[PDB]
Amino acid sequence: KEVQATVMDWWEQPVQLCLPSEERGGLTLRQWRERWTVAVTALQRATGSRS
Amino acid sequence: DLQLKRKMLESNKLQQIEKQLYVYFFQNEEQLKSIVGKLEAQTGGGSSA
Amino acid sequence: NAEYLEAKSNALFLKLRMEELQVLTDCYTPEKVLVHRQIRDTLEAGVKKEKQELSTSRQILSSYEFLGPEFEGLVQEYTRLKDKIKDNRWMLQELSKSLP
Amino acid sequence: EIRSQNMKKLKDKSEEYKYKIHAAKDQLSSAGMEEPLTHRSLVSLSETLTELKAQSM
């Protein structure tokens, strides 16, 4: 069960959410991940890529 | 489970970069701006055709 | 039969421990360990600052709590009076905006 | 007799796993990794900061 939890922590990487009020370039890490997620989904739509 | 998750990371380079975004946020703000901005510029160039 | 079952138990456990350690090396690269250190130091500085604001706020509170229940009734009466004066001053400010 | 042959193969694999375990521990130590820097430790440190801000307010 401990090994399965270590595999979960490697797969989720929860530390990235520990500082929500830090801003770099006038945006929070969450807003940067949202910009990334929107840009990745726009690029997957444009590439006609049947995922 | 471990063999499945490793094959996902080897096949999807965009997911591998997503997992590094927080490293760039704390170490190199210009590189964060450049990586996200290159992905956004590759999506926006479609109005001069 | 006893020796064979012992050897199979040990081999299964060592395989499990090996895969765990390989996931931990894949997790904690030198660049990420540096970022985790910056995050730790920012969090520890936050925890230390808040423990100090909490302690100072509790000491000033205990100095007023020593003045007894009759003082706490007088504080409630003054707070209720100061709120009414603030409401009446706000009403006067809105009328004078309406002349050209 | 089949179990005895399989026992030899299991002992040989057990020594192979001990070697990989040592190499992985040496790599983790070389990365400057400490127990307070783990994902679990830092999340627990974030949760304790949020609990303290609620008490301070």
Numbering used by the authors:
A (entry chain D): 616 to 666
B (entry chain B): 549 to 597
C (entry chain C): 254 to 353
D (entry chain A): 173 to 229
What do the paper's sentences say?
Branching MT nucleation depends on recruitment of the MT template and nucleator, the γ-tubulin ring complex (γ-TuRC), to the side of a pre-existing mother MT to give rise to a branched MT with matching polarity to the mother. Both recruitment of γ-TuRC, as well as maintenance of polarity, are carried out by a conserved protein complex, augmin. Augmin is an eight-subunit protein complex first discovered for its role in localizing γ-TuRC to cellular spindles. Vertebrate augmin consists of eight subunits, Haus1-8, that form two biochemically distinct subcomplexes, tetramers T-II and T-III.
As the most suitable target for structural studies, we chose X. laevis augmin complex lacking the unstructured, poorly conserved 548 residues of Haus6’s C-terminus, a truncated complex which we had previously reconstituted and purified. Next, we performed 3D reconstruction and refinement to obtain a cryo-EM reconstruction at 6.9 Å resolution. However, we were able to establish unambiguously that augmin has a relatively uniform radius across its entire length, comprising a cylindrical density of ~40 Å in diameter. In general, the predicted T-II and T-III structures were in good agreement with the cryo-EM map, forming extended four-helix bundle structures that match the radius observed in the map. Perhaps unexpectedly, although T-II and T-III both consist of a core parallel 4-helix bundle and each is composed of a dimer of dimers, the global architecture of the two tetramers differs substantially. T-IIIcore is composed of paralogous subunits Haus1 and Haus4, which form a coiled-coil structure and intertwine with the coiled-coil C-termini of a second set of paralogs, Haus3 and Haus5. The remaining three quarters of Haus3 and Haus5 form a continuous coiled-coil that folds back on itself into an extended antiparallel four-helix bundle, forming T-IIIext, a bundle of equivalent length to T-IIIcore. However, in contrast with T-IIIcore, in T-II paralogs do not form coiled coils with one another, but rather Haus6 and Haus8—structurally unrelated to one another—form a tight dimer that then associates with the Haus2/Haus7 dimer. Two T-II subunits, Haus6 and Haus7, both displayed a classic CH fold at their N-termini, which had not been previously predicted from the protein sequence.
